């Protein structure tokens, strides 16, 4: 409707297996440009599937989904492709010195890059350096956030991070660096929900809560 509405779901139901259990049932939300939507809920609630729908990997059986522009997705499982740290961050996107430095900093990769003699030109892989789980999760988040997009779909990017690093990156990256970007963050932490403009709590594909942090706290 309005140019400032980034993503809308109206009366959305969807199925992974035709004739089976709906993975999402009667979903409704509207996200304005620059807002942070937190998507909470237990294992199997339909959180990753909700992102998949936005990405066109799962079409709804009913209802309407609309999103403006380009998406950048961060998978709940971190990954790399054999190559340099720098290529693992920027591949497929033009180099921009400032953005690059700001992303490395916000994702706490500055320190790790400085330990190598080849710095961000260090080759990742069996035959080079093997990143730890934590390093791989930070580089996967940096890859997603570096890309210029109208909508960032961050699927539990801190699931494999320690809580001290998670707090720092949630604050420096998701809240500060990305302050005016449209973000859908899959997280069930109260520490994160506190900062969201809107919250969707999914339970077995259904919307158990949709509203502000004040409305949630009141419940």
């Amino acid at each position, epitope marked *: 409707s309005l140019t400032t509405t980034e993503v809308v779901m109206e009366n959305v139901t969807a199925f992974w297996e035709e004739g089976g259990t709906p993975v999402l049932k009667d979903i409704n939300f509207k996200i304005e440009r620059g807002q942070l939507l937190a998507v909470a*809920g237990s294992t199997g609630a339909g959180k990753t599937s909700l992102l998949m729908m936005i990405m066109g990997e799962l079409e709804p059986s009913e209802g309407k989904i609309k999103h403006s522009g380009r998406i950048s997705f961060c998978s709940q499982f971190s990954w790399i492709m054999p190559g340099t740290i720098k290529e693992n961050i920027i591949f497929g996107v033009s180099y921009d010195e400032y953005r690059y430095r700001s992303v490395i900093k916000a994702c706490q990769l500055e320190e790790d890059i400085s330990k190598f003699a080849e710095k961000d030109n260090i080759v990742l892989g069996e035959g080079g350096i093997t990143l730890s789980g934590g390093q791989r999760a930070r580089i996967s988040l940096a890859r997603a956030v570096y890309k210029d997009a109208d909508l960032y779909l961050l699927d539990s990017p801190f699931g494999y991070l320690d*809580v001290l690093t998670e707090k720092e990156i949630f604050e420096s990256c998701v809240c500060k660096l990305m302050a005016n970007k449209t973000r859908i963050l899959v997280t069930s932490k109260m520490e994160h929900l506190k900062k969201a403009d809107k919250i969707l*709590i999914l339970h077995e594909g259904s919307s158990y809560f949709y509203g502000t942090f004040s409305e949630l706290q009141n419940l």
Partner: nanobody, 122 residues
Framework: QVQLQESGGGLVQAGSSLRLACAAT????????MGWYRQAPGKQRGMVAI???????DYADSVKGRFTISRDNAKNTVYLQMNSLKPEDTATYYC?????????????????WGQGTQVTVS
């Protein structure tokens, strides 16, 4: 009405092995990630090892190959098996857990920390 409690700490010699335990008690509905952290005087607190509800692990480079983190979901307890202890391992070891309390209407977590246990390596 939720508590984490570390145990198994003490004064040991270099090259020795020790096992730390951290039990989550109280009005627990569920637990996501759990982990071990440490802080030495003058130094900042940092991760040692973390473990997901599924049992996936990660270690700080300084402890990988020497320490093992394990989890028992039935007992809501996380363990840190520490082998090949070095004087650089001397610190207060803290346990963390992402916990959903019973009085919460939704599947939401809050971060909890234990009081800590001292590990002094001679």
């Amino acid at each position: 009405q939720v508590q984490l409690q570390e145990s198994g700490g003490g004064l040991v010699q270099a090259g020795s092995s020790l096992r730390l335990a951290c039990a989550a008690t109280g009005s627990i509905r569920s637990i996501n990630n759990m982990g071990w952290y440490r802080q030495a005087p003058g130094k900042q607190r940092g991760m040692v090892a973390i473990i997901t509800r599924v049992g996936n692990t990660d270690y700080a480079d300084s402890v990988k190959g020497r320490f093992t983190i394990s989890r028992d979901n039935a007992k809501n307890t996380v363990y840190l098996q520490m082998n090949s202890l070095k004087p650089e391992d001397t610190a207060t070891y803290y346990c963390h857990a992402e916990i959903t309390e019973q009085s919460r209407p939704f599947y939401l977590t809050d971060d909890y920390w234990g009081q800590g246990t001292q590990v002094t390596v001679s």
